[PDB]
Structure to design on (143 residues):
């Protein structure tokens, strides 16, 4: 899952 | 002596957009703070502050009245401090949560976090506020  | 317990729900939903936005944002998400099951937390909640990642404009989002929620589009999950301030004239005046605003890739996401606050020896006006919102005096 993409994170920032 | 007296102790009151009341419940808050933190949640979010996230949907993968069929068409991303022009900036490349792939998801619609919504984060909220509510009372469980019909309870209205406005009786004791003065405002909720949602601290968004600084990639968002005006990242410090404030709701002073229901629904306490933020609707946004973005491309990744991130850690979101959430401050709930109380209709209190004495300490404690707020509680702070660390919320994980996460997006998944499979499409639909719903998340719900049930928190329990306890107030020890509240003023009688604040105590009334708590109980009207579903709170519980305890041992």
């Amino acid at each position: 899952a993409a994170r920032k | 002596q007296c102790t009151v317990q009341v419940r808050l729900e933190l949640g979010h939903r996230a949907q993968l957009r069929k068409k991303p936005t022009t900036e490349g944002f792939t998801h619609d998400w919504m984060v909220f703070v509510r009372g469980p099951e019909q309870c209205d937390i406005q009786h004791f909640v003065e405002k909720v502050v949602f601290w968004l990642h600084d990639s968002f404009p005006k990242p410090r989002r404030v709701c002073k009245e229901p629904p306490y929620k933020v609707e946004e589009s973005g491309y990744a999950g991130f850690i979101m401090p959430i401050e709930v301030h109380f209709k209190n004239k004495e300490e404690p005046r707020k509680v702070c949560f660390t919320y994980d605003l996460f997006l998944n890739l499979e499409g639909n996401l719903n998340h719900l976090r049930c928190e329990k606050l306890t107030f020890n020896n509240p003023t009688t006006e604040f105590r009334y506020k708590l109980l009207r919102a579903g709170g519980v005096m305890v041992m």
Summary: Chain A touches chain B through four residues (CB under 8 Å). Chain A is about 0% helix and 0% strand.
